[PDB]
Short mmCIF file of C-alpha atoms (C1' of nucleotides) in Angstrom, two decimals:
data_model
loop_
_atom_site.label_atom_id
_atom_site.label_comp_id
_atom_site.label_asym_id
_atom_site.label_seq_id
_atom_site.Cartn_x
_atom_site.Cartn_y
_atom_site.Cartn_z
CA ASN L 1 113.40 9.65 44.11
CA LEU L 2 111.65 12.87 43.11
CA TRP L 3 109.26 10.98 40.82
CA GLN L 4 107.48 9.17 43.65
CA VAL L 5 107.10 12.20 45.93
CA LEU L 6 105.97 14.57 43.17
CA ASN L 7 103.29 12.10 42.02
CA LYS L 8 101.37 10.99 45.14
CA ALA L 9 98.75 13.02 47.05
CA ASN L 10 98.63 15.51 44.12
CA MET L 11 101.95 17.00 45.23
CA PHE L 12 102.84 18.36 41.78
CA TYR L 13 99.53 20.22 41.65
CA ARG L 14 100.19 21.45 45.20
CA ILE L 15 103.54 22.93 44.16
CA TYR L 16 101.88 24.06 40.91
CA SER L 17 99.14 26.01 42.73
CA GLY L 18 101.63 27.23 45.35
CA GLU L 19 100.20 25.88 48.57
CA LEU L 20 103.81 25.18 49.62
CA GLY L 21 105.28 28.49 48.48
CA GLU L 22 105.69 30.83 45.51
CA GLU L 23 109.46 30.50 45.49
CA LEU L 24 108.87 26.75 45.17
CA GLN L 25 106.53 27.54 42.27
CA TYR L 26 109.55 29.17 40.68
CA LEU L 27 111.80 26.17 41.35
CA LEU L 28 109.23 23.85 39.84
CA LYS L 29 108.78 26.04 36.78
CA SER L 30 112.55 26.34 36.35
CA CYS L 31 112.49 22.62 35.68
CA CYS L 32 109.29 22.83 33.60
CA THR L 33 110.74 23.67 30.17
CA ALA L 34 110.01 22.72 26.56
CA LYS L 35 112.99 21.04 24.90
CA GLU L 36 112.49 20.07 21.28
CA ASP L 37 113.97 17.42 19.00
CA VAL L 38 112.30 15.99 15.91
CA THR L 39 114.87 13.33 14.98
CA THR L 40 113.82 9.67 15.35
CA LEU L 41 110.18 10.75 15.64
CA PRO L 42 107.22 10.16 13.32
CA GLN L 43 106.26 13.05 11.05
CA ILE L 44 102.86 12.78 9.35
CA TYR L 45 100.66 15.15 7.37
CA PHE L 46 97.29 16.19 8.78
CA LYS L 47 94.81 18.13 6.67
CA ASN L 48 94.04 21.56 8.14
CA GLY L 49 91.80 22.82 5.34
CA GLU L 50 93.26 23.55 1.85
CA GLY L 51 96.67 22.60 3.23
CA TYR L 52 98.54 20.26 5.53
CA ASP L 53 100.42 20.49 8.82
CA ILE L 54 103.38 18.21 9.60
CA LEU L 55 102.33 16.79 12.96
CA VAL L 56 104.96 15.06 15.08
CA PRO L 57 102.97 12.87 17.50
CA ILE L 58 104.55 12.62 20.95
CA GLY L 59 102.99 10.54 23.68
"C1'" C H 1 102.16 10.66 1.36
"C1'" U H 2 98.90 6.73 6.77
"C1'" U H 3 103.04 7.64 15.35
"C1'" A H 4 105.12 8.10 7.42
"C1'" A H 5 110.36 6.39 6.83
"C1'" A H 6 113.40 0.87 9.10
"C1'" G H 7 114.57 -3.73 11.16
"C1'" A H 8 116.12 -12.34 10.94
"C1'" G H 9 114.20 -14.17 17.44
"C1'" U H 10 116.76 -17.95 17.05
"C1'" C H 11 118.21 -22.68 19.69
"C1'" A H 12 117.27 -27.05 22.97
"C1'" A H 13 114.30 -31.01 24.91
"C1'" C H 14 112.09 -38.73 27.96
"C1'" C H 15 105.59 -36.72 31.63
"C1'" C H 16 105.96 -40.40 34.27
"C1'" U H 17 104.18 -44.64 36.72
"C1'" U H 18 100.27 -47.38 39.61
"C1'" U H 19 95.29 -48.94 39.40
"C1'" G H 20 88.52 -54.43 41.21
"C1'" C H 21 82.52 -49.86 39.54
"C1'" U H 22 80.80 -53.06 41.71
"C1'" U H 23 75.78 -54.25 43.73
"C1'" A H 24 69.46 -55.87 43.05
"C1'" U H 25 65.73 -54.95 39.74
"C1'" C H 26 57.75 -57.99 37.23
"C1'" U H 27 56.91 -53.13 31.71
"C1'" U H 28 51.78 -54.42 31.52
"C1'" C H 29 47.68 -54.34 30.72
"C1'" C H 30 43.27 -53.15 26.27
"C1'" C H 31 41.76 -54.12 21.19
"C1'" U H 32 37.04 -55.26 14.49
"C1'" A H 33 41.24 -52.67 9.32
"C1'" U H 34 37.29 -52.78 7.17
"C1'" U H 35 33.58 -52.55 1.57
"C1'" U H 36 34.40 -52.47 -3.72
"C1'" A H 37 36.61 -53.78 -8.51
"C1'" A H 38 36.32 -55.99 -16.80
"C1'" A H 39 42.93 -55.43 -17.24
"C1'" U H 40 41.96 -53.20 -21.43
"C1'" G H 41 45.12 -51.39 -25.23
"C1'" U H 42 43.33 -56.20 -32.24
"C1'" U H 43 47.54 -58.96 -27.28
"C1'" A H 44 49.24 -61.83 -31.83
"C1'" G H 45 52.55 -61.21 -35.44
"C1'" C H 46 52.03 -68.08 -36.86
"C1'" A H 47 52.26 -73.38 -39.22
"C1'" G H 48 53.64 -75.25 -45.37
"C1'" C H 49 54.82 -74.56 -50.18
"C1'" C H 50 55.89 -71.87 -54.77
"C1'" G H 51 60.41 -70.74 -55.48
"C1'" C H 52 68.22 -69.43 -56.01
"C1'" A H 53 67.00 -65.65 -52.23
"C1'" U H 54 67.09 -64.53 -45.57
"C1'" A H 55 63.56 -60.75 -53.11
"C1'" G H 56 58.60 -61.50 -54.12
"C1'" G H 57 53.79 -64.39 -53.97
"C1'" C H 58 50.18 -68.33 -52.34
"C1'" U H 59 47.59 -71.57 -48.57
"C1'" G H 60 44.34 -71.37 -43.58
#
RNA sequence: CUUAAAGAGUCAACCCUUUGCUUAUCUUCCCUAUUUAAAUGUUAGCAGCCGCAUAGGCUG
């Protein structure tokens, strides 16, 4: 699948630095998005100096 | 307010059987245990006889 080919011989960094094309850089980055959901995830408090931040640790 | 917050692992059982660790052995020679000295500590608390005494006295 795409997971094997993008992960050997540093192929994801090769598409990321555009040795195989800038329009491919676009295709890669079109899939590289940040989708967010905080349900069923741990939510802890970390001290940031006179206050706390709710950190949601993702692996 | 801690990768916070939350959670039933349950069940079941035939390890079997078999067997030759035998064989032969020099332990061995050696040689100073020597010398003293208070048993003291009263070292015994007896035998009769005068008596109701297992109270108290006397006799040696």
